[model samples]
Every structure is written in C-alpha cells, then in structure tokens.
Target chain A: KVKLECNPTARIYRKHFLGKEHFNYYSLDTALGHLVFSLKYDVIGDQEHLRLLLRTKCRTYHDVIPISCLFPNVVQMAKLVCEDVNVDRFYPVLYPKASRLIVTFDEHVISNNFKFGVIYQKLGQTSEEELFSTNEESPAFVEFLEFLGQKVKLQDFKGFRGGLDVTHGQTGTESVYCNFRNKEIMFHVSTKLPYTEGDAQQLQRKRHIGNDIVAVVFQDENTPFVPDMIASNFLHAYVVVQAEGGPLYKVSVTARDDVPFFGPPLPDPAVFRKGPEFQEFLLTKLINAEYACYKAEKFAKLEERTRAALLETLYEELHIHSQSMMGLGG
Target chain B: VKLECNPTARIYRKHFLGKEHFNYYSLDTALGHLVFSLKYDVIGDQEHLRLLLRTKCRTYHDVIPISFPNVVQMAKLVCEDVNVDRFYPVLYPKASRLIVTFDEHVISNNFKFGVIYQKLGQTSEEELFSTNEESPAFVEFLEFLGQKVKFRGGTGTESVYCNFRNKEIMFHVSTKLPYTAQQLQRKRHIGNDIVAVVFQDENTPFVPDMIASNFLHAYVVVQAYKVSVTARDDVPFFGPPLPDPAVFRKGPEFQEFLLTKLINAEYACYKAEKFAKLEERTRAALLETLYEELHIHSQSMMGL
Candidate 1:
C-alpha cells in the first residue's frame, strides 16, 4: 500500500466521509446491490466550479481523470462499472480502477487554471505596435473574440465597477476574461496590455502571455508562427488564424513535438467561415489544446502526483470500508 | 550591605537592562576586580526564549543556569491590556509579585473590589467603557468606590471596580483582557479567586477548564437575568439550595442571594475535588521549583 494522499481541496474527516465543509458519506446497499453517486456545484477553493465525485468508496480518487479518459461519457460509463460492484467484491474491481474513472458529463470539465494568450500581427510589421494594437481593426480577429465571448461570458480586464458605475464603459487597452463552461479562461490580449519602449524584450506584454501554455496568434497575413519566435518555456502550442479574403479565416494548428494531438480536428484546407460552427470548433479546440499541453513532460509530472495521490486514497478507503463490512478483524 | 531585595529581583532588574547590549559588566569595572559578564542569547529560532550567564574573573569560571504556584515564576509579567498603549515592568523588592503596568497604568485598583469585564459588550455604542471618555455615571461609580479611574480607549473593557456589595469581590473579566492561547493574566487572577461570577449575556455554556484554573472550583454563571451555580463534585451545599433559578429577580433580594452564594461558593470550592487536585499539583510543582532555585543559589554562595 502507498502513502494515501487525498486532494487538498477535498475535506476528509473519517474513513469514508468528506466532512462538514462538503458534508458527504459513503454507504453500501446490500439489499439493492447498488452504489450511489453524488456531485456538487460550489466554490471548492476560491474558484467556483462544478465537482463530480463518487459519494462513497471512491471519494476524491477520480477527480484526476480528465475528460479525455472519461470515455463514452461519464454518467453512462460509471454506471456500467459501479453496477458490477458490491461491498464484498468492490476492491477487486477498483484496485486497477484508473480504467473505470467515473464522474459527470452534464458540464465540461475545464481546469481552473486554464488560460490562452491572444496576440495580433500584420504583414511586414513585427514591431510592438502591430502585434499589440486595438486600432489595427482586423474584423476577423475582433469577430473571433466577440463570438467566443458570447459562447461563454466575456468582459474587460477592469471588470464591473462599484455602485452605479457597473461597467468600466470604455478603456484604452483591456484584456478579456470568460467563465467558459465553469472554467475561468482569461485571454492575454496584447493590445489590451501595457507596453514599454527602447527595450526589445517586451516584458509587460510577455508578463501575461509568456507564461500561458497555449496562445491564439491572429495574423493579417499568412505568416508562419515559429514557436521559438517568442521566448517562453510554457508556450508549447499555437493556434494561428489568418484573415483571408471573402471575410473568411485560414486556421492552422502547431505544437511542440512532445505535445500530443488535441482537436475538434481542424477541417480540410483549414479554413473557417465567420459563423457559429467555426467559433464552436475554435473554442473547443482551444480548451482541448490547453488540456493536451498538460500531458507534456513539464506538466505530466504534476498530473502523475495528482493521480497517484487520488489512487492511494481510493485503495485505502476501499480496503478499510470493505474489511469493516466483512466483520473480519484480519 | 547592597542586598536591598531578594536575589531573583536583583537578577531580573539588572539583567533586563544589561542583556539588551549582549553583555553585562559588574559596576566595579574601574578597579579591574572581580567581574560578572552575563551573556544572553536565544536559541530554537528565538522561540525557546532563554538566557545563558557567565563570569569574567580571569576568563575562567562560568555559570550556565537555565509555572504557577510561585507567583513570580507563574506571572506573565507583561501588561496585556488591549486599551493600554505601552507596558512598564514593575518589580516588588520584598515580595515575589512582579506586576507589569500599562502605559496609562491601572494595576493599583483596590483588590478590595475590582471588576474586569470580558466580552461584555456586543457593539461599540452599547459599551460603557468604549473609549477613554467615561460616562458621568461610570466615572461616579468608580470615584464613589474611591478607585483610580483612568479610562482606556476601545470597546475592550478590562474595567475594574473596588466596591460591589461592599464585599471586595474583584472580578477578572475575560472579554476585557487581550486573548492568548494561555490567558495568563486572567488565569492568574481568576485561578486564585475561590469563587467568581461568570456573567453571560446569553445562555452560553461554560466549562471549568475554559479559564484554565486549578484554583477556581466554583462559578456563579449569571445568564439571561437568571442565576445558576456550578462547583466541583465534592463541594457541599453550603449556600442556600440555589433559589428556584426563577424567584431571584435583580433587586436587593437577588443581591442578597448572590452575595451569600458567592461567599459560600468560596468556602465550598476550597474542599472541591478540582481545587484540591490543583492545590496538590501547585504544592508539588512549587516544592520542586524552590528546591532547584535554592540548590543553584547555595552552590553559587560557596566557592564551588
């Protein structure tokens, strides 16, 4: 048995209880031969989001199973596995339970820390002015941000003001934020950020954009976005959208060699019309790309710790609860 | 001839000033005679709070020497009044009492009668001693008792009064004193009081250990204009079997019943189990501590 490490977010008071802050307990239904599932939507830490956990025997053990592994949807697959489980035989079924990670499917699972950097550029101009400007007015770039903002909720950096002044009204430059599917993804808009001069390394712009694992590079011309163009250890993937004639967009996806494939897979010819379908695909792809980056070596190690901790808690809970049910001291 | 007070008092008074410079030299430095250089430093990340002492006679010999019943040892020795802005340490020459005086100083309130209100007021407006300016009635009440009245600021009231029922019942209020994990100030006073009245604005439950006292065995918990008494298991029913918890309204009748209960509660608490065990522990700890202190001083007295 490994040293059991539970989620820092999940409150555990006893062997099979989540405790008062969350207030949940696990049970064995010998009569019905059933297992119950309960999910909650509240602020786990400071961030408000929906959480899915097995009410008993599992606890925070399955929280690390991302949407990718939640195959064939969460609700249906969970039932397929849980229906076969009972107090006597539960341990054998779930001991190697990574394959049986069960949760909810009603809401998309967006990691709380997920973010995307959105920068702009035009042909023949690599300077700060073109890359970070509100006035350049590429209708396609504006339309993309506006479309995605509607899908979620979009607002300026200086959000809702106090009292009667509910909005900042208008500002020179402002980043955009959205609560997309309960996941807070803030877009690092270059033109919306402050700038410094006589210094080639634009720290003010990169301060937000640099640390972002994935970025959306909007270009007026078909300029290739070299990943190394901007010095950032975190920027592993790029989703470049070129504004073409006929008010259409030429979309391209590029990522580091180690960054595994992610998609709402880009359509053939990789061109999108300024419509709802393109925006849906673009937003889904952006969220998926962020999730994919975590699989890279830099973030995979963290995912390993989280999954290991969750599994140890599962094994510990299952062993303890089942033994008590058996009424056997050994 | 210069041994005006006890040696412990002399140690604290002299070292409190000299240790700040990291070194302490004896007064007869000009003669190049026998000198004592006390070197004090703290270990355990400044948490263990200790001092080490040594002598400077030809740079050879050195002496390294390192709560409650013995007042000086048990004493917090710090004025933890929230309203007070500064603290001045005061040491008694002939006694073991080391009372720390606050900047505006109020320790001399006649123990004949004193009242410290702990968590008395819900809001600043309702607090009687909310600020430095006292209400006329409050000023008169303290003055009438011939008590020194210096009102400190803030809603926190460590207010003490000298005369209540003319019985000299000194109250160490919980709300008025600055809170600490070990409320040493309140503990020092309340723990010593054989009987105390714990006034609760509401029907709040209290346990004996809440105040951390081995000496306080009886409490007159006054709540919702009602009076209830609690004492240790062995405490005999000395006072009148507590009035129906109903009949006693706040009047001369109530005061008569309350004072009688308080007086007898003290008598009964002395024989109570909690106080008895406490006194036993106090006696044992005190004897051991005194023996250690005496042995160290005696060895120093001789040429050891």
Candidate 2:
C-alpha cells in the first residue's frame, strides 16, 4: 500500500477500519444418521463472532522531513496533486508554486527580500552566465563576457533577471523581467546592463524599465514551494534568460511531482521577433536587471550600517533567530 | 372930580419909581397924569390922526373922559415919556374887563358815577329820612330831600341847588347832580361833597346830623375852595366874619365887599370838612369795599 509522509514537524493525520462474516452445510450425512438412530434426539445452537478495529495515525513519522521524503510538506503535497491533474497543458503557471508561490506566499518567507531572491537566483542566472562565459568563440566576446561576469558579481548582488539575444554576433535585443506570485508578471525594454558600481545610473538611463512589478502571491503553497527552497538552498546555481530583450525565458530542468515549477516550455527568441509589444516586454525585463542591482546595494548598505545594533539585539533576544527564519509568520 | 372912563384899546401901563416915591404921591394924581400922557401921545400919533381931534377934546372931561368911536372895535394906544416914578395904579381909558377864570381845582363838577352816587341812588330815601328826622338826623335826611325833588325837567328847573344853601351843598349831597359849567362857578366843594355824601352813611346819625344842621352852602363853597384851590385863593374868602356895616361897627362898602367875599366861605368850610372826610373815607372804602368792586369792574372791562 502506498503511504504518504510529511515532515515530522508537520501537523497531519489519517484513519482506517474493516469487518466481515460467512456460513456452510452437509445434507446426506444428516439423513443416514437419522436411519441408524431413529430413536436419537438431535439438538443444535447457532452462533457467530466477528472482530474489527479502527486505526488512526499522524503523517509525521520523523523529526524533520528528508529531502527524500515524499513531498516533504503540504507545499509538495499540493504540487503533486496539481501535476496529477495536468494543469500545465492548458494554462502554464507562469509564476508557479515553486518559483513564485513558495517564496512570495510562504508564511515563513513572505518578505519582499525573499521574494526578490527567488526571482534573482532563478531568473537572473541565465543572462549573467551567457554574457560572461569564456567559452564563446570570439576572443573579444570572451574577454567582454569575462569582464561582464566579474563586474556583475562585484555588485552588491541581491538578485535579478534579464536577457539579451545575439543572433549571429549581431545584438538581437535586451529585456528586463520580474516574477510576481499568482498575479500578472511584467517586462520592459532594457537599454543597459547591470553595473558593479552606480547601478542607479544605469537604471535611470534605461527609461523604459517598468516600475517595481507587484503581483499577487497566492495562498497555496504548491506554487512557489520548490522555487523558494531551491533559492534558499542553492542560491548561485539557477539561471534566468531574457529572449528578444524581454522576460520570455524558461528553465532547463523539469520539476518532480513534489517540486513546483513556474512557466511552461521556455520561450523562443525567434517567436518574439514580430511585434513592438513583445519587444517592449523584453526591453523592460532587461532594464529591470539594473533595478535589481540597486535594491541589493541599498540592502547591503543598510545591513552594514546597522550591523552593531542588529547584532546586539540578536544576541539579547533568544527567539530572534527562529522568528526571523520563520519570516512574517512568526 | 373923580370919574370913570373907558379908554381906547391899549396895553395898560404902570410905572414904578420904587415904593418910597409911590408913598409920597396920592394915587389919583399919579394915575391921572400917567393916563393923560398916554392918551395924548396916542392921539398925537399920525396912525390915528383922524381920531386925534375927537380923543383930544374928550380927554379933559371928567365923566366919559375918553371914548372910542366904535365900542366893538379896538383902538391902539401907546404911552411915551410917562415917568414911571409918578405912576401908581394908573387906569387907561378902557372898559372894565372882568376876566372870570375858572378851574377844576376849585370845582370838579364833572360828575363821575362812583360809590357815593351808587349808594345814594339805591337807598330808600323815605326810610332813611323817617329813621333820622329826630334831633340827630341821619345824612339820609339829604337823601330824603333828594327823593322828593323832581330831577326830570328842563335844565335849570332841575336845580339841585334850589333847596340847598348854595351850589356846593347841592353838588355834594345830591345824587345825579348836573355838572354843567355854570354850576361849577357856584360850587367848589363838589369833588369833596361827593365823597362826604358817600361816607355819611358810615357815621352815626347824631354826628352826621350835627354836621348837616350846620352845613352852610356858602361855607361849603369857601371850604371847597380852601381844600381844592390851595392857600393863595383861600386868603381872600377866609377873612374874619364881622357884622354888617349898617351896625356902625363896619362900613357899607366894606360889608358889600365882605358879602361878595363871603360867598365861598360856607362852601369852603364844608369843602374842607368833606374833602378831609372824603379822603379818609375813600381810603378806608378802598381798603374795605372799593377794591373788590373795582376788581369786578376791571374784569368786566377786560371782558374776562
């Protein structure tokens, strides 16, 4: 029998019960016995006994759910249910339970910073990697990419997503992108890339960048749980790409039933060449790349300036760590 | 010869050379000389030259010594160089000009109806007379006399003076006394008589009767003049009362002068008595009676 388990700390339960009874007979033996002993008086008493027991159990069988546990928490459980129903075939979860839901909507990680983190790590990695990789054939391109990578990394890096397509060495286009939770996501034309220093200047120059994108993060844990976990655990590995200078990009990995995903099959650059609307979307996404950098810089500066007081408070308050980890839910 | 003459009409002239010189000469000699000189000078003048011959002959005559051709016409004469020292009581040839001077000072005969008149007229004269005809007769006795007298007649016939001794008694005693000019000459006591008449009613019959018994009309005239005419006119009539000249104690001429002089004497005494009594009575009456009457009269006059 298949059984579902959840994190040991999770509060969940299940129950079961069953019962049955039957009868049989022999007629010829009864007739012979009657001839041999005509004077014998026969007596019989019929009785039957059946037993059943109900069983109830909690889903938490361990102290903490292993990454290996079947859908470790309710978030995974909901995602599994979504996949079973084939939701992606018709309408893609552009902002899925993993990428947008978990980070943006998680009671424990609903902070704007955590939401930004998921978008940055997952959606920003593609453009940064592509623009900076030394494997490119052209020596100038390779050097440029290397310079770009180093420059981008040196920034007070929070996270961001952007894209620039180069079709046969000609700069195709650039885009800025942002991921909201369940609400509509947005893009803008990006005229510039992220800078290590003075990112504000770059953002100002890219006049087309959309205002801070705000999208509803639905209450369901299935959407953003995988992405939220991925961002928190392996922040540096995920990638985001910009297509036609727009936010039309997709991930390379598939999500398991327990893992949440956002967006359907990756968007193609070729498919986005025709319209200004699409072009604008890509451009705006690229421009957002700079804004993301600016947000990171401000956060770093705040942290540095307030470190002494923050540390003192953290030390004085025993519950701070747990509370902060739980985010707004605490 | 002593003669009286009427000289031509001319201003009378008297020359005086002091009293001493006047005493030395007889009055007739001095007056004759003064008159002759005046007539001579008057006729000698050419202005009357035509009449000079007639006047010239006439001057020497003793009787009718000088005569004018016309008695009505007045002749002019002048006296020149007639020594005033010789002249005394000179008589020019002129008619006797008897100037009769009259004055209300002696008699206010304009009868004003006052308290006296009203009292007298309204009283019952018969009753008053009967009540007072005894030894002490009332002043109402005069009122009885007034009632008997008929006042409605010709002017002269209604003489209030007929029974009275003189005009003064008539005026003083009688109510409705006529105040003509002729009566004024005979009675000087009229003003006082009116007052006395009014006051007599207040006196006891005895006193008033005594006063009335002795009430001489002539004495009233003299007394009225005495009180009303002042001391200058009084001295003449107030001379002593002596017997007639025929008694040999006085001359006829003096007696005649005295008789004429005595005319106002009785009236004067009554006038003085009544005047004093009237003044006193009027003052008392004003205080007691006249004031209210006058006040009512004044109110009526004012048409209040």
Candidate 3:
C-alpha cells in the first residue's frame, strides 16, 4: 500500500478562521473515505500561480457515491455557508470544527476561504517581461545559471507564472554562488531571447511588467527557521546567497517570501558512504537543519571563500545539491 | 522580591519601544543581574511574520538554569499587549523594544489575556469571500478542526446566536480588528453576524477559541497549512527533494505542535491517497493546460 506516512488521529482547535490573513486548512474524514486534503483559493497569495498546493481526490476504500454526486452536495453546503452569496457556485473549505477544514477533496475537488489571492497570479497577466527583481539580482542570477552550463531542468512547479516556467530544471538546472552581496541567486526562468544583461533592462523600459518572465531573485541567510536554500516549484535555478551584511546588495533579496521547507524521512546517508566518519556525519551533524544549511552555503563559500585550505571553490559549489540525489527513494 | 501582576497597570507597556536595536532585552531593574532577552527575528525575508516570543533568560549570573512555568509566565508577562503581527526586533526605546520570531508551527493567539487586542483591523476591504459547503458541512468541518462550537450574546447585543460557525470566525474577527464597525459594516459589508462563545459553556463539548471569547477576536491557529511527508521505497516525487520542515517545536508546546504535524501528516496522506487515485489522464490534462498557459502566453507575445 503506497501511502505517505501520517498520524490522522491528532487534531486542532480554533475559534475564528480569518479569510484575509490566513489559508484555512481542513481534514475531510468520515464523509470522505480517505482523509484527503486540499487548498482553496480566494483572497489568494503566492508568486507562483498555485491555486492548489496538494490536490487529490475523494475516492475512499469503501464503495462510494461517484465524486460527481459528492461534489454538488459539498457545494450545496457551500452555498449555505459562504459569506459571498452571489458567488453562484463557490468552492467549499468547510471549517465546521477545530480539526477538519475540508476544501474540495482534490484539485478537481476545490474557500472560508481566507482571501489569499494576490500571492499567486497567473503567468500571462502582464505585458512587460522584467518585473521579478533588480539591484543587479537578475544579472548575477543569469551568471549563476550560465555558470551551471546546461544539464538541469525545472522541477517542482505549480504552474506557469509571468509567461515562463519557474522550475528547478529537469528543465536543466543551473546555479551559481552570488559573490556580489553574499546573496543566493534565484534564476527565474525568462524569455528565449539571448538572455543577457541589456535584454532585461531594455524590456523593463518598454512596458510595465505585471507578470515578470525570467527574473532573478536573491536571498540572504541568517534568520532562524528559514531554509538556507530557497525551495520552490517555481524558479529554475536557486542560490543560497550570503549574509545581509554582505555587499553587492542595494536591497536584501533573500528576505523575500520563503519557498517553504519540507520534512521528509530521508534515508540514512551512511548506506552509500561507509565508515564511522560517514556514520557520524549522517547521524550527528548531517541530519540537522543547521548542518544542511552549512553544506549548502559551502557551495558558494568554496567559490567565494576559495581559500587554499578547503576543497576547490567552484568544484564543490556545483556539487552541493547533488547530495540529495543519493537519498533518492530507497 | 517579585512584582505582582498589576491588573490596572500597563506595567509592560513601556517595553515595546521600536527605537532600539532588536527592540528587546528588558530589565527587571530588580530581577536584577537577569535581563529578558525576548528575541524576535524579523529577517528581511518575504514572509515577514515574527510569531514566537523566542525568549532567552540571560543574566550576569549565568549559573541559573531555565525554569518551568516561570519562563512561560514571565514570557507571558513581557509579551502582554504585543500585537503578534507587529514587526519585532525594532530600534526604538533605544535598543530595548524587541518582539517575536518564528520557526515551526505558528502557535495560536496565546492564552495570555494581557496582550494587546491584535488582529483588530487587518480585514481588508473585500468582505464577500466564498466557500464550498452550506451550514451543515461548514459546521462539520469546524468539528473536524477540533472546535467546540457554541454561541453566547446576540447580534447587536453582547455575543450573538450561532447562525453560522464559519461566520462567527469572520464576524467576530472584523469587530476585533482595530477597524471601526462603520468601516467593517456600512462600507466593507463584512459578515454582520457577531456572536461570542461562552467558554464556560462546556454546556457544549465543542467550543470556539477561548481567546476570541474575551471579545478579543482571533484564533490560535490561522493561515498556512503544513505536513511531514514521510516517503520511501523508490521514486520520490520528481524534481527537488522535500523541503526543510516549515515549523520546529520544543518544550511543552511540543504536544500541540505534534498534534499539528500529525494533522498535517494525515491531511497530506489523505492528499497523497487522493492523488494516487487521480486519473492519469486528468494529471496529463493539468500538465497540458500548464504547458499551454506557458506556450500560449508566450506565443501571444513572441514565441516560446
């Protein structure tokens, strides 16, 4: 049975589910066979046009009404519940209680929706193509991607934004250590035109870019709880930039909205690399978030700090993210 | 000697000076030699919320170990009137006014009654948000969220009746925000149903958030959902591996935090199961749609 590990019994309690400021989460048990989850959109938010974060269906273990039957029923309740009466047919994120907040069962499924709508705008909304960022961030970002040569492809994407796909690259990922301000580069995939320095500038001058195509966002580290690397379904290439105190930065880029972090049960690294040395690295130092960031920072640090005592700079920079590949499904 | 919690005094009010660096580090002037390093991390990230109190009891006397409920109470003491949404670690009151930080699960509107009534006016102008289910399902959903839904006063009266649990969440919320009723009502058209919960009314096993009952209006948990994906044996979800955990936990809050992770895990598991059953063709359709959005949008301009 291929099921993601989870504890379904635990619960949460709350009084009011604010629509504007928060994304109400729900668990559809009892009625839905499998306790499925979904994210509803309304006063929406997020840079990547991600309406549904983790979409799934309501198919349960037991024989059930065709979801076709269930949906309208759910939406029926939705009509009675939603604040906006004229919305015609709205999606249901029933927050009837403390623990469960059932949005549509899946992407096909569907808000009390807090109005978190601004964050995730679709890709084609703008005429201008260079609205992602500035402060030399785009150039430094392009340099970061080109530095990777062309072996990566974009991965982990919700959908297109600003006319191009923001991906990690199955699309062929490329990255670099932004030495300018100790900033981490987020090479937002851009237009096909020979992506160079003047193109971005010339395009921005041409029109107002409501939805930017291929912009580079820089991230600086040194905050508690945030991941060192900017993880996103958007953005083809990522850079773990230097500290805010670092130069090359007119403004702080790393401080932008976080791409969020995930905690998966990663396999033991010791499996491949042997010896107590490997074991200690995996057990004590390696698994913690602090260590992971240290490892990620080492990528650019090698190049930026290219000091003689350490492994060659650029050499290790490119290899930083490759370690996760070894943990690929055991 | 300790200062008793003064009900009439905003004794903690002087501490919120944003004029200082990190805007934290209060002196008891008496707890003597021991100062409260109530740290709040406002790193310039896109997500600017500093929710947790991130307290550290520092002292010229380093030998004293951290204690139980004491820190919690002390933490509560200093954090009173702290609008959790306000930016922290400021540079006012000249290097003393610090606020809060974050890491793991956003703890709900705390049990601390002394804190300022925050979330008083953030409800944006858009009042008509939509939902999927009607009352039954909506209330059913609230039940799933672990709430004991009940009603107290009336509409224009004190608390009101329970016409809709979902609306109470919204209605009470608008009233609580610093916004005037006129702005929330005659103008924005926010939910008009204002009902307060009788916390003492276990008369109903299910109750609404206690914090909101004080007429303070706020939920302990709001916005953002998370899960701990636990996977294995084979092809992981393509692209990048899992992200760093969103929220971290420690101390007594661990149980509540655990419950949160557990719920998210269940929710994700439910999501994963649903995704597994998702028709392959539907998956392909979504992918194709995205491809078209990219290609079509590009074609409308130059070309992909």
DockQ of each: 0.01, 0.00, 0.01
What's model 2's interface RMSD, roughly to a tenth of an angstrom? 96.7
Tens digits of per-residue lDDT for model 2 on A141-243? Answer: 2232232222232122233433222233122133323333321222222222233243433333122222322111111111222323321221212223222
- Alpha-carbon runs more than 4 Å astray in model 3: A1-200, A204-239, A242-253, A257-330, B1-304
TM-score of predicted structure 1? 0.33
**Which stretches of candidate 1 lie above 4 Å from their native place?**
A1-113, A125-140, A150-173, A314-330, B1-304
For residue A293, what is the lDDT in candidate 3?
A: 27
Q: Per-prediction TM-score, please? A: 0.33, 0.15, 0.15
Residues A1-330, model 1: lDDT tens digits: 111111332431222222111211233445432243333323334444434444332223233222321222233323443444334321211111111232211111224545688888677655544455444556666776775553222233333211111144232234456654445556767665555565456666776677888889888788756775776778888899887875788889888988888867678777888886876677678877777787789887776565545544544554454344223231
What Cα-based lDDT does every candidate model obtain? 0.45, 0.24, 0.24
lDDT of 3 at B216: 20
Interface RMSD of each: 31.1, 96.7, 21.1
- Please name the candidate that would achieve the greatest TM-score relative to the true structure: 1
Tell me how many residue pairs clash in candidate 1: 8
Judged by whole-model lDDT over C-alpha atoms, candidate 3 comes out at 0.24
lDDT tens digits by residue: candidate 1, B1-304: 2211112323434433312211111212222211121222344344222222211211222222330011111111211111221111111111111111110021122231112222334222123112223334333333332343332211134455444434454444444444443445444555556666655444555555454455666777665456677766767776667655454565556665665566666656555666556545543444344334433332332212
